[PDB]
C-alpha cells in the first residue's frame, strides 16, 4: 500500500545546526490527491506532540524554528537551530490514504562535547542476599558520548555472561546519558568471593576507572 | 483545558479481551474524530483506528481490523477500544487523540496512553533493595545512592525520591528483563556526600498493575 | 485527471418504481484512498441539497427511500420508491482530489398517465399595440408528456419563425407540464389580418385542438 | 436557522469587477470551511473555491485561480469572492455552501443563490401587459389569465398573484431570450370562471436589476 518513507533513520546533530528530515511517498500517487502531510515530535515516554499540519502549517504554540515544506512527492521537516530539547524522535504522517499510516521515524540526538562518567558500585544488600541472591551493580552517571565499556571482576575473575547494563534516554537539559551495569550472582557465590570491582572505558577517560569493594569490609 | 485520559490498560492472557477508555475534557466529542493510535516496545507509531461519534463512522487498520472496535458515548465524553483476540503483537501503549475544531487530518490532543501487556505470566511486584556505597568508600563530595526495584512483572513501576522533593540528579533506568522472565531496574540519586548519614532519603516505589507500593529509607549499612 | 462519469444522464421512470442512478470514476485509483462520495439533489430554481454522504450515511431529515453504497471506483444512488416531489436532477461528487468535482448530472422525470392540454388563445392588449408590437399566446395547461405541437395561422397563413415557446419544469406534485407559445407581430401586420388560432397536437388529444379569436370581435 | 444568504450578484461588464458575500446565521463560519460553487445557465455545478477562516486557507478551480480571491470577515459572519477580470463564461449563479461541524465532505448548507451576468448589455426593465381572461374562453372546467413581462434585461424576474395570496394554479414561465438581445416571459393563472370581473387579480413583477415594481390589475377587457 501507500507508505511514507523517512530518512534519515537517526542523526546526530549540535545545537545550533539546521537539521532536516525527509519524508517520501512508496508510489506514484494520481494528481491532485492531498496527503495532508503532519509531523509529529515525540519525547521519552511521553505522547507525540504536533509540529506541522498540511504539509507546512506551524501548529500553535510550536517554536518557529520547526518548518514544513513539501512538493511533490516529498516533504520536509526542518528544525533551523537545534536545541538540547529537541532530542525526539520526529514521524511524518500521509493522509493520502484512509487509514493513514505514519513513516519509521527519525531519531535525532544532540551532539555535545565529551563528558567522562562519574563511577560508583554498591554492594549487595544483606536482605536480598536472605533470598538467595546478589545483584552488585554499577552506576556511570552524566557522560557523552553514549558508548561506554564496563568490565566486571570477582576476586580477578572477569565476569562474562552474568550482567545486565541499562541507559537513559538522553538527558533533555545537558545531553549526557548514565548507565547502570548490574551484576546477578547466587548468594552461595557471593559469599565465597572477597574482591568486586567495577572497571570502566570511556572516551572521556585517559584511561579505565576502577571502583571496588570487598565484601563484609 | 482539553484533555483526553485513557484508562484501563493491563496485563491480559493472549486471546483474550480488554477495553480501553478515553475521557475528555475541554471539549466534547461530538464535535471531533477520536482516534487510536499504539506503540509496541521501542517500536514507532502505528494507526490503529478512529471513529466519528456523531454518527457511528469508524475505519481500522488491516492489523487489528476484526479483532478491535471502537466506539463512543457522546454523553459520558468517553470514547472506548474494544480489543479481542489479543496477541503478543499487540502489546503496546495505547493513545487516544483526536481531530480538533474542523482541522482535520492533525491530532492535535493526545492522552498520556495506556499500557497493554498481552501474556501469559502472573503479575507479580518488585522487591526493592536499597543501593548504598559500602562504608569504605570515598568521594570527592558527591556521593551516589540509589532502590533496585526487582523481580516484577508486567511494566510500569514508578519511582521518586523523598515523595516528590528530591528530582535534580535522579536517574531511573528503563527496565531490563532478566532470564527469569521478570523486569527489574534501579533508581539511583546523587547528593552531597556529606549528608549521608543526616539526612533521609526515601524511595518511593508504585507498581500499580499488583497494587505494590514501597517507601524503602536507603542508608549506609551500620558495620 | 480524475472525474465522475454519471449515467444515465437522463431517466423517465413511474410512481414506485424504484430508481438506481450511478457514478463511475474515470480511472484506476489507488486502493485505500477514498472518495467520500456525496450525492445531491436539486430542483428548479433551488440550491442543491444533501442527500447522501461518505458513499452511504443519510443525512438527517432526507427519506428513507434514498440509500446509496459502492465497490470499488462505482457508487450507486437508489430511490427505491419514486415519488412526484423527486423529480429533480441528481448529482454524485468525489473527493479523491482536491478540488472535489461532481457527476455532470443525471435528469429524473415523472411518468404518469396521459394527460391532454387545457388550450387557451390571448389577444394582444390594446396598451401593447400602442408601442408597435403585438404579441399573441397561446397557453397548453397541465399536460403530460411532454412532447407537443403548436402550430400558428393568420388568415389562414402559417407562421414560421416567428414564434417562441417555453415550458414549466414538471409539477412537483401533479407531474404535469405546461406550455407558453408567443406569436410576435408587428402592430401594422396584426392590424391587416382577423383570424388568429392557435392549433395543438398531443397524445392526449384524439384530434388537433384549435383556439381562435377574431380581431376586433368580443 | 442555520442559514447561509448570498448578495451582490447582478450585471458587469466584461473584465468588470464584483464582490458576492455570503452571510452566514446560526453558527460561526470560524467552524466551518466555507465553499462558493456555481451554476451556468442550464449547466452542472462547478465547484470554485473554500476557504478555513481561522487558517486564511484557501483553494480555487484553475478556471478562477489569479482572478477571484475568496475571504472573510468572521466579526461580521460573512464569506466574500472578489472577482475580476470577469468573462462571459463566469456568467453563473453563485452558491456559497459550507462544511458543519467536522463532518468533511458534506455541503449540508447552502444558500439560495445570487447571478451573476456578464455582458456588454444595459440593463432594462420590462413593460407588463395583461393576458385577460375572457367568459367566453373556458378549457379544461376554468378561466386563465396572466401577465405578459416583456423585454427585460437581465434575468431575473419575479411574479407572485395578490400579494401571494394566490398560488394554487400559477405557472410563471422561463423566460426566453428574444431576437432583440431581451428577455420576455408570461405568468398565468387559471381561475373559476364564476370569479371573472368580480375578483381582483393583480400580478406583482419584480425585477430587481432595474428596479422596476409594477402591479398590473388584470381583468376581462370591456364587451
Known amino acids: 500500500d501507500i507508505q511514507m518513507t523517512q530518512s534519515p533513520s537517526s542523526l546526530s546533530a549540535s545545537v545550533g545546526d539546521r537539521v532536516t528530515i525527509t519524508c517520501?511517498?512508496?508510489?506514484?500517487?494520481?494528481?491532485?490527491?492531498?496527503?495532508?502531510?503532519?509531523?509529529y515530535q515525540q519525547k521519552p515516554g511521553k505522547a507525540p506532540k504536533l509540529?506541522?499540519?498540511?504539509?507546512?502549517?506551524?501548529?500553535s504554540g510550536v517554536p518557529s524554528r520547526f518548518s514544513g515544506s513539501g512538493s511533490g512527492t516529498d516533504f520536509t521537516l526542518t528544525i533551523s537551530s537545534l536545541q538540547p530539547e529537541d532530542f525526539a524522535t520526529?514521524?511524518?504522517?500521509?493522509?493520502?490514504?484512509?487509514?493513514?499510516?505514519?513513516?519509521?521515524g527519525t531519531k535525532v540526538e544532540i551532539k555535545r562535547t565529551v563528558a567522562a562518567p562519574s563511577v560508583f558500585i554498591f554492594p549487595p544488600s544483606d536482605e536480598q542476599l536472605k533470598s538467595g541472591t546478589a545483584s552488585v551493580v554499577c552506576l556511570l552517571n552524566n557522560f557523552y558520548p553514549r558508548e561506554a565499556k564496563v568490565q566486571w571482576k570477582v576476586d580477578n575473575a572477569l565476569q562474562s555472561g552474568n550482567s545486565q547494563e541499562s541507559v537513559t534516554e538522553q538527558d533533555s537539559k545537558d545531553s549526557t546519558y548514565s548507565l547502570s551495569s548490574t551484576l546477578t550472582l547466587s548468594k552461595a557465590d557471593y559469599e565465597k568471593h572477597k574482591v568486586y570491582a567495577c572497571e570502566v572505558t570511556h572516551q572521556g577517560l585517559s584511561s579505565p576507572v576502577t571502583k571496588s569493594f570487598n565484601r563484609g569490609e | 483545558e482539553v484533555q483526553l485520559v485513557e484508562s484501563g490498560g493491563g496485563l491480559v492472557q493472549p486471546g483474550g479481551s480488554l477495553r480501553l477508555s478515553c475521557?475528555?475534557?475541554?471539549?466534547?466529542?461530538?464535535?471531533?474524530?477520536?482516534?487510536?493510535v499504539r506503540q509496541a516496545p521501542g517500536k514507532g507509531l502505528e494507526w490503529?483506528?478512529?471513529?466519528?461519534?456523531?454518527?457511528?463512522?469508524?475505519?481500522?487498520?488491516d492489523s487489528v481490523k476484526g479483532r478491535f472496535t471502537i466506539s463512543a458515548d457522546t454523553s459520558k465524553n468517553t470514547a472506548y477500544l474494544q480489543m479481542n483476540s489479543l496477541r503478543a503483537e499487540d502489546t503496546a501503549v495505547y493513545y487516544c487523540s483526536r481531530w480538533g475544531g474542523m482541522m482535520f487530518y492533525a491530532m492535535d490532543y493526545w492522552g498520556q496512553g495506556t499500557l497493554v501487556t498481552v501474556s501469559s505470566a502472573s503479575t507479580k511486584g518488585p522487591s526493592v533493595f536499597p543501593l548504598a556505597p559500602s562504608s569504605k568508600s570515598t568521594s570527592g563530595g558527591t556521593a551516589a545512592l540509589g532502590c533496585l526495584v526487582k523481580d516484577y512483572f508486567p511494566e510500569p513501576v514508578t519511582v521518586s525520591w523523598n515523595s516528590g522533593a528530591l528530582t535534580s540528579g535522579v536517574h531511573t533506568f528503563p527496565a531490563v528483563l532478566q532470564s527469569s522472565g521478570l523486569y527489574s531496574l534501579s533508581s539511583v540519586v546523587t547528593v552531597p556526600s556529606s549528608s549521608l548519614g543526616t539526612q533521609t532519603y526515601i524511595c518511593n516505589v508504585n507498581h500499580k498493575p499488583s497494587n505494590t507500593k514501597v517507601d524503602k529509607k536507603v542508608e549506609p549499612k551500620s558495620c | 485527471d480524475i472525474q465522475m462519469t454519471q449515467s444515465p444522464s437522463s431517466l423517465s421512470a413511474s410512481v414506485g418504481d424504484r430508481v438506481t442512478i450511478t457514478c463511475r470514476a474515470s480511472?484506476?485509483?489507488?486502493?485505500?484512498?477514498?472518495?467520500?462520495v456525496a450525492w445531491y439533489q436539486q430542483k428548479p430554481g433551488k440550491a442543491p441539497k444533501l442527500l447522501i454522504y461518505?458513499?452511504?450515511y443519510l443525512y438527517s431529515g432526507v427519506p428513507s427511500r434514498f440509500s446509496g453504497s459502492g465497490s470499488g471506483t462505482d457508487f450507486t444512488l437508489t430511490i427505491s420508491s419514486l415519488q412526484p416531489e423527486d423529480f429533480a436532477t441528481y448529482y454524485c461528487?468525489?473527493?479523491?482530489?482536491?478540488?472535489?468535482?461532481f457527476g455532470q448530472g443525471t435528469k429524473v422525470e415523472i411518468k404518469r398517465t396521459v394527460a391532454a392540454p387545457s388550450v387557451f388563445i390571448f389577444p394582444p392588449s390594446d396598451e401593447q399595440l400602442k408601442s408597435g408590437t403585438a404579441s399573441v399566446v397561446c397557453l397548453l395547461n397541465n399536460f403530460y408528456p411532454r412532447e407537443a405541437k403548436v402550430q400558428w395561422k393568420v388568415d389562414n397563413a402559417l407562421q414560421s419563425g416567428n414564434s417562441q415557446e417555453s415550458v414549466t419544469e414538471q409539477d412537483s406534485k401533479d407531474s404535469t407540464y405546461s406550455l407558453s407559445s408567443t406569436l410576435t407581430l408587428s402592430k401594422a401586420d396584426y392590424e391587416k389580418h382577423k383570424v388568429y388560432a392557435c392549433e395543438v397536437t398531443h397524445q392526449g388529444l384524439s384530434s388537433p385542438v384549435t383556439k381562435s379569436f377574431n380581431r376586433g370581435e368580443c | 436557522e442555520v442559514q447561509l444568504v448570498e448578495s451582490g450578484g447582478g450585471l458587469v461588464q466584461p473584465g468588470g469587477s464584483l464582490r458576492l458575500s455570503c452571510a452566514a446565521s446560526?453558527?460561526?463560519?470560524?467552524?466551518?470551511?466555507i465553499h462558493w460553487v456555481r451554476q451556468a445557465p442550464g449547466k452542472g455545478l462547478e465547484w470554485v473555491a473554500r476557504?478555513?477562516?481561522?487558517?486564511?486557507?484557501?483553494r480555487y478551480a484553475d478556471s478562477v485561480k489569479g482572478r477571484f480571491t475568496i475571504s472573510a470577515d468572521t466579526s461580521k459572519n460573512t464569506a466574500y469572492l472578489q472577482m475580476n477580470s470577469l468573462r462571459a463564461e463566469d456568467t453563473a449563479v453563485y452558491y456559497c455552501s459550507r462544511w458543519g461541524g467536522m463532518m468533511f465532505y458534506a455541503m449540508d448548507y447552502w444558500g439560495q443563490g445570487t447571478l451573476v451576468t456578464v455582458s456588454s448589455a444595459s440593463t432594462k426593465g420590462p413593460s407588463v401587459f395583461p393576458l385577460a381572461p375572457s367568459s367566453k374562453s373556458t378549457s379544461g372546467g376554468t378561466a386563465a389569465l396572466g401577465c405578459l413581462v416583456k423585454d427585460y434585461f437581465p434575468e431575473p424576474v419575479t411574479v407572485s398573484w395578490n400579494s401571494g395570496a394566490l398560488t394554487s394554479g400559477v405557472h410563471t414561465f422561463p423566460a426566453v431570450l428574444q431576437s432583440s438581445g431581451l428577455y420576455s416571459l408570461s405568468s398565468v393563472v387559471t381561475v373559476p370562471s364564476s370569479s371573472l370581473g368580480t375578483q381582483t387579480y393583480i400580478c406583482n413583477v419584480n425585477h430587481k436589476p432595474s428596479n422596476t415594481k409594477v402591479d398590473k390589475k388584470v381583468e376581462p377587457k370591456s364587451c
Open positions: 476557504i478555513y477562516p481561522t487558517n486564511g486557507y484557501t
Open positions: 461518505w458513499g452511504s
Open positions: 446560526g453558527f460561526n463560519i470560524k467552524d466551518t470551511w
Open positions: 461528487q468525489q473527493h479523491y482530489t482536491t478540488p472535489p468535482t
Open positions: 480511472q484506476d485509483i489507488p486502493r485505500r484512498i477514498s472518495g467520500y
